[PDB]
Ligand binder design. Structure first.
Ligand SMILES: O=C(O)CNC(=O)C(=O)O
Ligand SMILES: [Mg+2]
Ligand code: NI
Ligand SMILES: [Zn+2]
Length: 331
């Protein structure tokens, strides 16, 4: 078995290998990359997402989200308070202000220490989940707006034609902006490209050990656990690396820098934070190996998790028994 310790692997494809996306994901899995739950892909040196980022300040963040924490430093939840719209130029300026800017630090490890120590005492603002793309239409390789769709994958694998569409999302981050512990909708893959700015630190649990994280979470967030059998679908809970280590939960960490791709694999729980002002683009995708994960994916029926139009068909075809109760949660 390849990569039996479930280490995060880093790949350096050549320009020739960067042509066929599906084939390169399949190659990474042949080398056991999926066991970690997360892989890094450094693009060939000849590749570019677009010519420059000089012209992005007029993108609108219609609903910036202030991420307010409750709990203790290593075990907290966050809720998102809606703020007034602002442009990417206005957001960048806010991120760089004395109130919100990254503090002086030695290195990524020092900054990671400061994050886990101090996150709860601040409420950074996140421009998350903005439909759109920063890939130039002429970028032919690893263009996240031109991938094969999850609906066409399900159709190719299972023969059923379904409604729905699959498009990317932009995330504009600042120091301490945080993504809570989660897997993707229907335990899909995700791919994330860091277009510009400061780094993003990731934590990940190997898919084979996901249930260990869930059990810990039920112990640490006992009210939430009673409220919903899949409350991590709410995407609000954080647990620090120190707390994971104290409870024997297997995990790994890695920092993504501008120009790098990250791939999360089916049922790979992940969480993390941004180091300063940045812009990432991400999208869900599928492969034939996903289908079995989609059939077994947990679902939130309590009404909190509330997701996209396109998840309907996935639940309806892959999880017909669950569909009724889940749709009651959606309405
Ligand atoms: O970048 C973020 O805030 C969150 N991204 C992801 O969870 C992902 O790409 O799967
Ligand atoms: Mg603009
Ligand atoms: Ni994710
Ligand atoms: Zn729920």
């Amino acid at each position: 078995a390849q990569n039996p310790n479930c280490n995060i692997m880093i790949f350096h494809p050549t320009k020739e290998e960067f042509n066929d996306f599906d084939k390169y994901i399949a190659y990474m899995e042949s080398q056991g990359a999926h066991r970690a739950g997360l892989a890094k892909i450094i693009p060939p040196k000849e590749w570019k997402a677009r010519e420059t980022y000089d012209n992005i300040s007029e993108i609108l963040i219609a609903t910036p989200l202030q991420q307010v924490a409750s709990g203790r430093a290593g075990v907290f939840t966050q809720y998102h308070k809606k703020k007034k719209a602002m442009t990417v130029g206005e957001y960048r300026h806010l991120a760089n202000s004395k109130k919100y800017q990254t503090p002086p630090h030695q290195n990524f490890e020092d900054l990671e220490r400061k994050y886990w120590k101090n996150r709860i005492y601040n409420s950074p603002i996140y421009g998350a989940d903005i439909s759109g793309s920063l890939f130039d239409e002429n970028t032919k390789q690893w263009n996240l707006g031109h991938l094969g769709t999850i609906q066409d994958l399900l159709e190719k694998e299972c023969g059923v034609v379904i409604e729905g569409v699959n498009t990317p999302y932009l995330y504009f981050g600042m120091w301490k902006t945080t993504f809570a512990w989660h897997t993707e909708d229907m335990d899909l893959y995700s791919i994330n490209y860091l277009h510009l700015g400061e780094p993003k630190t990731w934590y990940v649990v190997p898919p084979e050990h996901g249930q260990r994280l869930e059990r810990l979470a039920r112990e640490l967030f006992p009210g939430s656990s009673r409220g919903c059998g899949a409350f991590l679908r709410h995407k609000v809970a954080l647990i620090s690396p120190t707390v994971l280590k104290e409870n024997g939960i297997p995990f790994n960490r890695i920092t993504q820098e501008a120009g790098e791709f990250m791939v999360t694999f089916p049922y790979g729980y992940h969480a993390g934070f941004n180091h300063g002002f940045n812009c990432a683009e991400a999208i869900n995708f599928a492969t034939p190996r996903w289908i079995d994960y989609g059939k077994m994916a947990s679902q939130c029926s309590c009404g909190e998790a509330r997701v996209t139009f396109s998840m309907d068909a996935f639940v309806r075809i892959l999880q017909p028994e669950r569909y009724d109760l889940w749709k009651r949660g959606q309405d």
